[PDB]
Structure formats: structure tokens, C-alpha cells
Write a protein that binds this DNA or RNA. Structure first.
Ligand SMILES: [Mg+2]
Ligand SMILES: [Zn+2]
Length: 1316
DNA sequence: CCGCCGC
RNA sequence: GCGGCGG
């Protein structure tokens, strides 16, 4: 029935749906009422609209029905106005003009021009809209007793002086009201009225003007004409004049258009649209330029526009505009077409971009900030409803819509336009909905950045020698609290307590609880495990799971071998501990997370459970053999009187129990041990020391090895029961060094299994330690022995220094030469003394404490040893130039005053370096994670076989000469890989797909030595077909384990980690972290080296303030300008492939991508990256640098369209889907030509397809804005995005591959058949 | 990087 | 957010 949430979708909200999720409508602004905490009704906190205040309430919504529309600030103020782009109004300036309603908008038709044709959609000032839209008859009053220079309705021109002090502003028709005077070529009082029109012809019998007094009223005479001159005032009308001779039309006030009849039948017709004024004072019909029109205001004006905009229409319109016009206008349309598409495409239409119904967030979600703003809206939205039914005066209506539109923006996003402040008290912007979603600590960034855990604890860690990697020492007292609930129950299970509350009080104040509470706890923890965490959590091993074994005190006992995993020593470091609550959590915790199960490092296939100093120390001292004094003749190799004599000479004081006597030193002649045990007992009785050379009969051979060695054999053969397989993997021919053991571990892992190895580790751990204590090794000032030759070599070098001095005091050597030669003097002299001290220990004190420590993988480093016994000699000055004088002393002897001071400089520079390099906070582990945090393993052997050939030989360093890449590096590229195609090499058939093990990579190397293979066909992430993910055959052998990678493993992570941790130690040409940042980030490095874009041969032109390297061949040469200060190493003559270093130093990815191609950029990056870690000791598998780098080119540009336009940057694979189904399923081969794009790691992240993820880093506004328009459906895949859901991650156990697995019992299975 | 201690 | 220490 109910279904797992697999897809999430963001779409626009229909006002109908707003009512849909809605429960009641908040109708009033009453926050809190004192009388009863009980909510005051129908404001915000009412319970019907949201729900019951007592014991699903904070899950319902209410809506406020806005009077006149307002809009979403999110869709209007985002950089690219989603509405401004779509509608085509000024994208950023025009909107604001009418969004609040101050300015006007236009509709169906205007035929008249203010000066230009009618504006289909534009807006004009109210004065001008009123002037011609509704017409504009404009008056011009006149001073009393003043005559005019224009008649009744005489045509007037704009700017003319109607009188001395008055002038007109418009052309059209100038109306005159009254004749205070009239001229008559052959004065009218208030009650007088002119019967005669404009300059009308007159006759004698014709009354002109009349009034009340029939007596003395204007009476015509002999041919008079009319010229009226004294108008009280003149009102000008924006109208045309149409004189008529006979009749007229409908009436004065009606509307007319061009053509419509005015008078005299169909003779005098109108020419413009306008109102009618049938004036008979001039016997003419003026049609004022005033026809109706329509237009609305503010959020309302766009609401209309949006509703009519027929996407389809503009879609087609843009289609034409797009591919036909020059790049200047086509580009604008293109960006405009996507939006249009998005809407139509997804369906959910754009008209909703307007707010008419503001959805109210639930009452329990917000217990204050947002409420103050909600009240504002409510108020104005309400004050407005009232201001509409009471009386609607315009100026107020608008002024109100404004404020309203402002408020609606507040609750959504404050600041975009001014900032709202709670009245006097704090000039602080009230946190609006947007502010609550973005920012460093917002809500989208909340689900990811982290938080504190229940069932946690932390304490100081202490070493627990006896403890096995399996377990961990945890303080009972801590466990008590940690496992409190689990304990309570078990308490009732056992009579200790009657109920839970009782068990609790029982632990509330009581001091011990003795054995019984303890018996219970220790019982509850039985097989459960907890996790442990170390300070900076760098790699997956930063947290391991252990079985807790309760202990006394405060500290937490940790296993020694895991001390390497978590960078953790015992000088006070503290670790945190957690508890897996779910039986599922517990499972994974102890299965795939326990310590003993994660032996190998995800970084390199090398072990991480490597025995450390102490263990090694012990193990070595016990396997070493001794050599003494050869008093004489060592020939028993043949004489029998040599067995007897040399054996009695031994009984004497002449021949030692360990003499250089080829076949056998008397030491072997004397003691011959049958059974293996036989040997050790003799030891235990004092006959033989462990380190003595004796003879011993083993399974099938008479072996000449010491007790110690043999004992070691047993220990291992005991750790793992298969005794034969034991000696098959150990070498008792040399003392056990950190490496001989390293390799033993690794071998054991591959050979006997995981857990069995764990057993051996503990084994070694135990013995190593014991033997360590009894061996009797300690340091004493005399233990640091100074070589007798030191006094020699220093003297030899000293005199030698005088020669160099006398040589300059003569003038032979330059000031510089002097210096360089002296350094050389010491640089060699010091190295001389180095091997000397060691030579003295090797020959005279084989068992020197200081020495033995160093040799054995235990502790100490050759370079250090030298600072004790030999001498630390060259310490550099402040800047960098090393000192001229060396530090002649050793630490054994008193390091002198100055020598110390001088040495100081270096120690300080090193400290500074460790600072800024440490605090970088695994910055790279951060960015790496950002671009690989979505990579996971879900598959079925991806079918696409496009492989990467791993090179077995390295080019030039000394010059052109093919070499065999170092053992290390070759491993790095081939270990745990899967062969793309089969390859017969030295007699063996290495099938296809086979995952080449270490041995198999040794083979290939040994073969390259002979000369049978130069490259290697192998599967890799760099060429995986699975869009989002990588499959089994492509990733490879590496796992925490050694067998092939299990599908469902968070490789993205794992790779990011393995690359980040190391970054902590990477502090002309420039490198280190910066080279790593420069490399992951496609950039133009300091020392750029001009790559050759054309592949031909080379030729130069010497000197001349500039040199020039020219790649020329068929007909053209790509000119390369190499500054007079550049270092070029390709010479006048031979060939140069595309993207080959023409200059010396670093290279620029972009260029190299263009010239050579992608398969080269990738391989460049990978290797150029490794280059730094390699030189820093770090050994990480190429796999990981690959996974990352691949993502750096998962996007490509478009040059030949089919669906979307060609200026886009979209996911590479998403195009392999389009092209595949455009040629395959649906015909019409519209090839989608693209261009591979090398985006930077950071930008790859930035623009990562899923919106959820974007909402996290960049800007939450833009991200959601765009994802809004195109109803985006976030296909839930990737750790980040799915983290927010709070759902099980798509990786790990969440792996779609196994998240669904069923367990049954043959009893219930046949039982389902019983149901059938 | 995480943990604490204090205006 | 400022200062001090620890890994
Ligand atoms: Mg430490
Ligand atoms: Zn693949």
C-alpha cells in the first residue's frame, strides 16, 4: 500500500491548491491574549484552522485571502526576473514601476499616437493616459477685460500667445466661451448671446446677438462681417474639426471611429477615434481624440499579462527569433525560451507567479519573528477589504495596495526592498521566510552541517595492551549512563527493580549498585558494540566499532594497533563514543564497521593494522642472530678434526658459540634439537639464548635457525591453525622488520581471511610486547656512541676547508664558487660521518639500543640517529640560503651555544609550516567531498568497454629514454584493477575482466623488464557508462577488504577522503597543496608552459629579445612566443604531438584539452596529482584521483541542437540519452554535437543538477527560484540531497541493490505454499 | 579540523 | 561573535 518516497517535486502553487492544503482562513491579527493562554479566535493560533491545543497540530495550514493581488518577491527580484524575462517588460526597471501600482499598463487597442503608434502593452503617465485615452479638453483661463486673438473654436497652434500674458500648450481646437466684444466691418454683456458664428457673412435684415432687453440688441446692417474678440477664457480640446453643411448624427457624447458618419449624410466623416460634441455655435462637429481604452495597475497588470501570454505563440516566435537573428538578439530569446519551455513542458502554468492567496505556516512550527510580519499583512489586507466597501477613493486605494504589496514581500523576503523593523528597540530586520532558508546557518544548510547526538560520551584515552583489536576499554560508570535505558529493562528482567521508574530512582542517588546492577549492565552489553571517534575525523577509519569490556576508572582503554588509524597518541587525546540503538544499526556497526574487519586502508591496499614501534621492537630482538669473535680458522666446512678440535677449542676460550665458520659455527655443532619444543626448553634452562644459532629438526628439514626465529614461527602458526600455510607465508631467514611484518599481515589477509588475520595481529601484538619488556632495552647517554672516525673526517674536511680558503685568498675562486664548494665539502663530509656511525653499530654493537630501535621498524630514523651519534651539521639561515658553517656537534656531546641558536632558525620555520598547513582543516577533504559526495556504486557490469591503458613506462627527465615506472607507482595504477581485454604476457593467460592481484602486478613488471608489454588494458571510472554511479568491473579490487568491490559502496566519499587526509602534509615552478588546488581547479598555474596546438616537428630561432619555437609541417606553423626568460627544451628539429610541453614547467588544462584532447587531460590531471603525493611519501591508488577528475568533465557544451539551444552546459550522459533515443527509437537523426567541457571541481559542484543540493551551498534564492519555474523533480540519488530528506542514504546499506532483502526459514517458506 | 574555558 | 589552552 504505502510507498517508499523515491521522487520529490517542486511546482508552482495553484490558488485552488493553496485552499486545498488549507484548514480555515486566518481572518484576524490577534497574537496573544493575557486573560487565558487559551488562544483568541480566528487570528493566528486558533485551533480549528490549525488544530487541537491539547493532547498533528503543527502540520496543517491556513490561508489569508488577499484583496488585490501581490507578487512573490522571489520571482521578481531574483537576478534574472523570472517574470521580467518571461513577460518581456523591462526585466529589472519597468517591473518595479507598476508592481506596487504607481505607474500604468496597456491592453487591447489604441489607434492614436502621443507621437509614436499605440503601445500594445507599455504604460504611460496618468496625465497623458487621461489626456488622449479618455480625451483631454484643457482649459486656459483669461484675465478680466482682456480680448483673445482666437475665435470660438478657431484652429490653434501650440505655443501661440492667446493674449499678452497667456499662451497655449496644445494644437487642435481652441474654444471660446463669451464675447465681451465683437468687431463688425461693413460689446456683449452677461445676458447677451451671439446668434452669429465665426466671421459669418451678414445682411441688413438679420439680428446678430440678443439678450433680455429686446431694446437696443445687436441688429445687423449693410454687409457686416463678424470678428469676435473678447472671450472670458479659452478651453483647448485635443480634437479635430469637421464643418457640416446640412444635418448631423446620433448626439453629443457618443463615441466615433475613423470613417463613421458625422453629418450631411455620408459626406463629413470622422478621421480619428473620439467623443462627439455637436456644437451649433460654429455649425461644426468636433470629435475629441478620446476613444475608450483599457489598462489596469500593479501586481494586477502583470496578472493580466501572464494570463493572456500564449506561451505557444511566443515559443514559436522565439523559435524564429532564436535561429534567424544575429548573436545579439538570438541569445536574448534563447534565455527567454527556456522559461517558456519549462512551464509548458512540466505543465504547471505561469499565471500563478502572482500571489492572491498567502499560505499561512502552521501554529506549532513557530512558537517571535515571522508573526509580527504576518500581523502586518493580515492588517493591511484587512484594512484594505474595509477600504473597498466603505468608500473607494483612488489615491488611498493605491497607497494601500503599495504598503500591501510591500508587506507580502516582507514575510517572504525582507531586505530586497528596504528593511522592516520592530518599532524602537532593535533596528534588526525581522527574519523572513527567505532568510530562514538560506545563509551559513539557515534551514537548507541545517540538515547537513550537523548536530549533537543522544547516547554519546567522550573521555581521555589510555592504551590497553591486553585488549584485542576486537574490543575496547570503556568505563563502566560511563556505560551505565550510556546504556541507561537498556539497563533499566534488564533491571526488571531481574528482581533488582519492580519497574522502570524504580530502577531509575535506584540509580538517582545510590553510590554503588555493587555487583548486581553491574551484573545486569555487563549482561546488557554482552554482544553489543559502540563506536569511537578521534579528533579530526579524516578518513572512514576515523570511527571504528569495538565490543565494550567494562573497566575501572575514568580513561578509556583503546587498542594499540588502531592507534595508527585514528591519528592518536596517549598524551591526553580524547575520543568520543557512541551507541548503535537499532538492531539494524548494531548489525552494520559490528559487521562492516567493527575494527578487526577494516584491516586494509581504503587509500592504498596496504595494511593499517601494521605493528607499531613497541611490538616490532620486541619481535625483532627475539628473531635476531648474534655474531661474535672468530679467534681463528673457520674451516669445519671440511675437517672432522675440525668438528672435534673446533668444538674443544670452543670449550676453551678460543672459538665462540657463533663464529664465522661457513657451514656451521660451533654453535650448531654442539646443540641439535629434535622436536621444535626441544629447542625452547633448552632455552628455558639456560643452555641457549633466543638469539643463538642452532640446528633444529622441523617437519621435513634439518634447519639451521635460532630459537627466536623458530619461536616466531610457532606464534604465527598458532595465531592461525593452518600451520603449513603459516610457514608458507613467513620468512624466518631474517630478523622481523616492520616491513617483513607489514607483508606478513597483508599476505595473511589474502591467504587465510579477514578475522583470522585479526587473530594473528593480536598474537604479534601480545608477544611483541612481552618480549619487549624482558628484552631489557633502554637508553643511556653512552648508548649513543660516537664513531672514532668523526674526529678523523672532520679534521680531513677541516684542513680541506683551509685549501679552499687559501685558494680564494689568492683570487682563484669567485666569491660564489667559494661558498658552493664549501657546502659541497660538508654535504659530503656529513654524509660520510652518517654511514660511519652506522658502520660502527653494524660491526661492533649489533645490539645497540638506539641502533636496534632504528633498524627494526620500531622507532628512530637514520637522519635522527645521526643527530645523536654523528652530528647534525647543516642548518639554514632565516631566508633559505643554508649556513656556511656546519653544526660540528652531536647531541651526545654538548651542542654549543651558537650552534644551537643557528639551528633554531630552522625549527621555527618548520613550526610555522606545520601551523598554516594543519589548520587548513583538511580543506581539500572538504572540496573533494563537495564534488564526489554524490558518487556511489550501483550496477551490473556496465556494458560499455572503453578502457584506460595504464602506461608501464615513463618518458623524459634526463632526456628521451624509456624507463620502467617505479614499482610503487606502477602498483598504484594496476593493483586491484580489472583487465579490459585479455593479455598473454610471459606464458600465462591473464583472462579478461580478471582483477589483477599484487602478484599479478609483479608479473607485469617483471615482464616489462624483459620487453613484452608497454601498456595495460584496464577498466576504470574515467570511462564508466553508468551516468550516476560506477560499476564493479570498473572500480576494482580495493575494498576495506581485498576481494572485488561490493555493489553499494560509497566510493565517491571514500575517494574524497583518501585524497583529503594526506593534504594535511603538503605544507619558478610551484607545488604542494596549491598545485593540488590548481590541479583540481582547472587553472592557469604560475609557471605556464606553452603547449603545442599543432602536431608536427620543431624548429627554433635563437636570441633576439625573444626566442621562438615553431611547430611546422604540411603548410602552417603555430607560432609560439617564448619570452627571453623562458626555458624551452624541445629543439630545432624533431616532432611534437598536440599538447606537448614546448616550455618547461606546469601546464594549462584548458589549452591541453583543446590541442591533444580529453583522454589526455584526464590522464594528465591524474598523474600530475599523484606527482605531489608520491614525492611526499603518500601512497594513494589512482582509482580515487580518477573518480574525482571524472566528475570534472561530466558536463559538455552544445553546438548542434535538437531540444534545447546551443549555448548550454548540461550533463554529459544526459546527452547520450537524447542522442541514443534520437537515432535509435525515434528517427530523424538530429545529431547533438557537443564539446567536452573541463569545468573546475568547485564549479562542477556549484552547478550539480539536483536543486536540493544547490539550495545548500550557492544561493538558496536563485536555486529554488529556477527550480520553481521548471517544476523540478529531484530524483533522490546522492548523499547530500538525500541527507536532507532524513531518509536512508542511497549508498551503503541504503543501496537500492540491497535495501530490499528478505529472510525466511524453510519452515515458513513451505508455509507460504501452505497458504496457497 | 574538535574540545573546552569565559565579556 | 572576542581571548586562552589541549590533540
Ligand atoms: Mg598527540
Ligand atoms: Zn563502468
Amino acid at each position: 500500500m504505502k510507498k517508499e518516497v523515491r521522487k520529490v517535486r517542486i511546482a508552482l502553487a495553484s490558488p485552488e491548491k493553496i485552499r486545498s492544503w488549507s484548514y480555515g482562513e486566518v481572518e484576524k491579527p490577534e497574537t496573544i491574549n493575557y486573560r487565558t493562554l487559551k488562544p483568541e479566535r480566528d487570528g493566528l493560533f486558533d485551533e480549528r484552522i490549525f488544530g487541537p491545543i491539547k493532547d498533528v497540530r503543527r502540520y496543517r495550514m491556513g490561508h489569508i485571502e488577499l484583496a488585490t493581488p501581490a507578487a512573490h518577491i522571489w520571482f521578481v527580484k531574483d537576478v534574472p526576473s523570472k517574470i521580467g524575462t518571461l513577460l518581456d517588460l523591462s526585466a529589472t526597471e519597468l517591473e518595479q514601476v507598476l508592481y506596487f501600482s504607481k505607474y500604468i499598463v496597456l491592453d487591447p487597442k489604441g489607434a492614436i499616437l502621443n507621437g509614436v503608434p499605440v503601445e500594445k502593452r507599455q504604460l504611460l503617465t496618468d496625465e497623458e493616459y487621461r489626456e488622449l485615452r479618455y480625451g483631454k479638453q484643457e482649459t486656459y483661463p483669461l484675465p478680466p477685460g482682456v480680448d483673445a486673438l482666437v475665435k470660438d473654436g478657431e484652429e490653434v497652434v501650440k505655443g501661440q500667445e492667446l493674449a499678452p500674458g497667456v499662451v497655449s500648450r496644445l494644437d487642435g481646437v481652441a474654444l471660446y466661451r463669451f464675447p465681451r466684444r465683437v468687431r463688425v466691418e461693413y460689446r456683449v454683456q452677461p445676458h447677451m448671446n451671439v446668434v452669429v458664428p465665426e466671421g459669418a457673412r451678414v445682411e441688413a435684415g438679420d439680428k446678430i446677438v440678443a439678450a433680455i432687453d429686446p431694446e437696443e440688441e445687436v441688429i445687423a446692417e449693410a454687409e457686416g462681417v463678424v470678428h469676435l474678440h473678447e472671450p472670458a477664457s479659452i478651453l483647448v480640446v485635443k480634437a479635430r474639426v469637421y464643418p457640416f453643411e446640412d444635418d448631423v448624427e446620433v448626439s453629443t457624447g457618443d463615441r466615433v471611429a475613423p470613417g463613421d458618419v458625422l453629418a450631411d449624410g455620408g459626406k463629413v466623416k470622422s478621421d480619428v477615434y473620439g467623443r462627439v460634441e455637436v456644437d451649433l455655435v460654429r455649425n461644426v462637429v468636433r470629435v475629441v481624440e478620446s476613444y475608450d481604452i483599457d489598462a489596469r495597475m500593479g501586481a494586477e497588470a502583470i496578472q493580466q499579462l501572464l494570463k493572456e501570454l500564449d506561451l505557444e505563440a511566443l515559443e514559436k516566435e522565439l523559435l524564429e527569433e532564436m535561429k534567424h537573428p544575429s548573436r545579439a538578439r538570438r541569445a536574448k530569446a534563447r534565455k527567454r525560451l527556456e522559461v517558456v519551455r519549462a512551464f509548458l513542458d512540466s505543465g504547471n502554468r505561469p499565471e500563478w507567479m502572482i500571489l492572491e492567496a498567502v499560505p499561512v505556516l502552521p501554529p506549532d512550527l513557530r512558537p517571535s519573528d515571522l508573526n509580527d510580519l504576518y500581523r502586518r499583512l493580515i492588517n493591511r489586507n484587512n484594512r484594505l477589504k474595509k477600504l473597498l466597501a466603505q468608500g473607494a477613493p483612488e489615491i488611498i486605494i493605491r497607497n494601500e495596495k503599495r504598503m500591501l504589496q510591500e508587506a507580502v514581500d516582507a514575510l517572504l523576503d525582507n531586505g530586497r526592498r528596504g528593511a522592516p523593523v520592530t518599532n524602537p528597540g532593535s533596528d534588526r530586520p525581522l527574519r523572513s521566510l527567505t532568510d530562514i532558508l538560506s545563509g551559513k546557518q539557515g534551514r537548507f544548510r541545517q540538515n547537513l552541517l550537523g548536530k549533537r547526538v543522544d547516547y554519546s560520551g567522550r573521555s581521555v584515552i589510555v592504551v590497553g595492551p591486553q585488549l584485542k583489536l576486537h574490543q575496547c576499554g570503556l568505563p563502566k560508570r560511563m556505560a551505565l549512563e550510556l546504556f541507561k535505558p537498556f539497563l533499566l529493562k534488564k533491571m526488571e528482567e531481574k528482581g533488582i527493580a519492580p519497574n522502570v521508574k524504580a530502577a531509575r530512582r535506584m540509580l538517582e542517588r545510590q553510590r554503588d549498585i555493587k555487583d548486581e546492577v553491574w551484573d545486569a549492565l555487563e549482561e546488557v552489553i554482552h554482544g553489543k558494540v559502540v563506536l569511537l571517534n578521534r579528533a579530526p575525523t579524516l578518513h572512514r577509519l576515523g570511527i571504528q566499532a569495538f565490543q565494550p569490556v567494562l573497566v575501572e576508572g575514568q580513561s578509556i582503554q583503546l587498542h594499540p594497533l588502531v592507534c595508527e588509524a585514528f591519528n592518536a597518541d596517549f598524551d591526553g587525546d580524547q575520543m568520543a563514543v557512541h551507541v548503535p540503538l537499532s538492531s539494524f544499526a548494531q548489525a552494520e556497526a559490528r559487521i562492516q564497521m567493527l575494527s578487526a574487519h577494516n584491516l586494509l586502508s581504503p587509500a592504498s591496499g596496504e595494511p593499517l593494522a601494521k605493528p607499531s614501534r613497541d611490538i616490532i621492537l620486541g619481535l625483532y630482538y627475539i628473531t635476531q642472530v648474534r655474531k661474535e669473535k672468530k679467534g681463528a680458522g673457520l674451516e669445519f666446512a671440511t675437517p672432522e678434526e675440525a668438528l672435534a678440535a673446533h668444538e674443544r677449542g670452543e670449550v676453551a676460550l678460543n672459538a665462540p658459540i657463533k663464529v664465522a665458520g661457513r657451514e656451521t659455527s660451533v654453535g650448531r655443532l654442539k646443540y641439535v634439537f629434535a622436536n621444535p619444543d626441544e629447542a625452547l626448553l633448552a632455552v628455558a634452562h639456560g643452555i641457549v639464548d633466543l638469539q643463538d644459532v642452532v640446528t633444529v629438526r622441523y617437519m621435513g628439514k634439518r634447519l639451521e635457525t635460532s630459537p627466536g626465529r623458530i619461536l616466531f614461527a610457532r606464534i604465527v602458526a598458532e595465531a592461525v591453525e593452518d600451520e603449513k600455510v603459516a610457514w608458507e607465508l613467513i620468512q624466518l631467514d631474517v630478523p622481523q622488520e616492520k616491513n617483513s611484518l607489514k607483508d606478513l599481515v597483508y599476505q595473511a589477509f589474502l591467504r587465510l581471511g579477514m578475522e583470522k588475520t585479526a587473530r594473528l595481529l593480536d598474537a604479534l601484538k601480545y608477544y611483541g610486547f612481552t618480549f619487549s619488556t624482558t628484552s631489557g632495552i633502554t637508553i643511556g647517554i653512552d648508548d649513543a656512541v660516537i664513531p672514532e672516525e668523526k674526529k678523523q673526517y672532520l679534521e680531513e674536511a677541516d684542513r680541506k676547508l683551509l685549501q679552499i680558503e687559501q685558494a680564494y685568498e689568492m683570487g682563484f675562486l669567485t666569491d660564489r664558487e667559494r661558498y658552493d664548494q664549501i657546502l659541497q665539502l660538508w654535504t659530503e663530509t656529513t654524509e660520510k660521518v652518517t654511514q660511519a656511525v652506522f658502520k660502527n653499530f653494524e660491526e661492533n654493537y649489533p645490539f645497540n639500543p638506539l641502533y636496534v630501535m632504528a633498524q627494526s621498524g620500531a622507532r628512530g630514523n637514520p637522519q635522527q640517529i645521526r643527530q645523536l651519534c654523528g652530528l647534525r651539521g647543516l642548518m639554514q639561515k632565516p631566508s633559505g640560503e643554508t649556513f656556511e658553517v656546519p653544526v660540528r656537534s652531536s647531541f651526545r656531546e654538548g651542542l654549543t651555544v651558537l650552534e644551537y641558536f643557528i639551528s633554531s632558525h630552522g625549527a621555527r620555520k618548520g613550526g610555522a609550516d606545520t601551523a598554516l598547513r594543519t589548520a587548513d582543516s583538511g580543506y581539500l577533504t572538504r572540496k573533494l567531498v563537495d564534488v564526489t559526495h554524490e558518487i556511489v556504486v550501483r550496477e551490473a557490469d556496465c556494458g560499455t568497454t572503453n578502457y584506460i591503458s595504464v602506461p608501464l613506462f615513463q618518458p623524459d627527465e634526463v632526456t628521451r629514454s624509456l624507463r620502467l615506472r617505479k614499482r610503487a607507482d606502477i602498483e598504484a595504477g594496476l593493483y586491484g584493477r580489472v583487465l579490459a581485454r585479455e593479455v598473454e604476457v610471459l606464458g600465462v593467460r591473464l583472462e579478461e575482466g580478471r582483477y589483477l592481484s599484487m602478484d599479478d602486478v609483479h608479473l607485469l613488471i617483471k615482464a616489462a623488464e624483459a620487453g613484452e608489454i608497454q601498456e595495460v588494458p584496464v577498466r576504470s571510472p574515467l570511462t564508466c557508462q553508468t551516468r550516476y554511479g560506477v560499476c564493479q568491473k570498473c572500480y576494482g579490487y580495493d575494498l576495506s577488504m581485498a576481494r572485488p568491490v561490493s555493489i553499494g559502496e560509497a566510493v565517491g566519499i571514500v575517494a574524497a577522503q583518501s585524497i583529503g587526509e594526506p593534504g594535511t602534509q603538503l605544507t619558478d615552478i610551484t607545488q604542494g597543496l596549491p598545485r593540488v588546488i590548481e590541479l583540481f581547479e582547472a587553472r592557469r598555474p604560475k609557471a605556464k608552459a606553452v603547449i603545442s596546438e599543432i602536431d608536427g616537428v620543431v624548429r627554433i630561432e635563437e636570441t633576439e629579445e625573444k626566442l621562438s619555437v615553431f611547430v611546422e609541417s604540411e603548410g602552417f606553423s603555430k607560432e609560439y612566443k617564448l619570452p627571453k626568460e623562458a626555458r624551452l627544451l624541445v629543439k630545432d628539429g624533431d616532432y611534437v604531438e598536440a599538447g606537448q610541453p614546448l616550455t618547461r614547467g606546469a601546464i594549462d588544462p584548458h589549452q591541453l584539452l583543446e590541442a591533444k584532447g580529453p583522454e589526455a587531460v584526464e590522464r594528465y590531471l591524474v598523474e600530475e596529482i599523484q606527482k605531489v603525493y608520491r614525492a611526499q611519501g603518500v601512497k594513494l591508488h589512482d582509482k580515487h584521483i580518477e573518480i574525482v577528475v571524472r566528475q570534472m568533465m561530466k558536463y559538455v557544451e552544445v553546438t548542434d541542437p535538437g531540444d534545447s539551444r546551443l549555448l548550454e552546459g548540461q550533463v554529459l550522459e544526459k546527452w547520450d540519452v537524447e542522442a541514443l533515443n534520437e537515432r535509435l527509437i525515434a528517427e530523424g537523426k538530429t545529431p547533438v554535437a557537443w564539446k567536452p567541457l573541463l569545468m573546475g571541481v568547485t564549479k562542477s559542484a556549484l552547478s550539480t543538477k539536483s536543486w536540493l543540493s544547490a539550495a545548500s551551498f550557492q544561493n538558496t534564492t536563485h536555486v529554488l527560484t529556477e527550480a520553481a519555474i521548471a517544476g523540478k523533480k529531484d530524483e533522490l540519488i546522492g548523499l547530500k540531497e538525500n541527507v536532507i530528506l532524513g531518509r536512508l542514504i542511497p549508498a551503503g546499506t541504503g543501496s537500492d541493490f540491497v535495501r530490499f532483502t528478505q529472510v525466511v526459514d524453510q519452515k515458513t517458506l513451505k508455509a507460504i505454499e501452505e497458504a496457497r
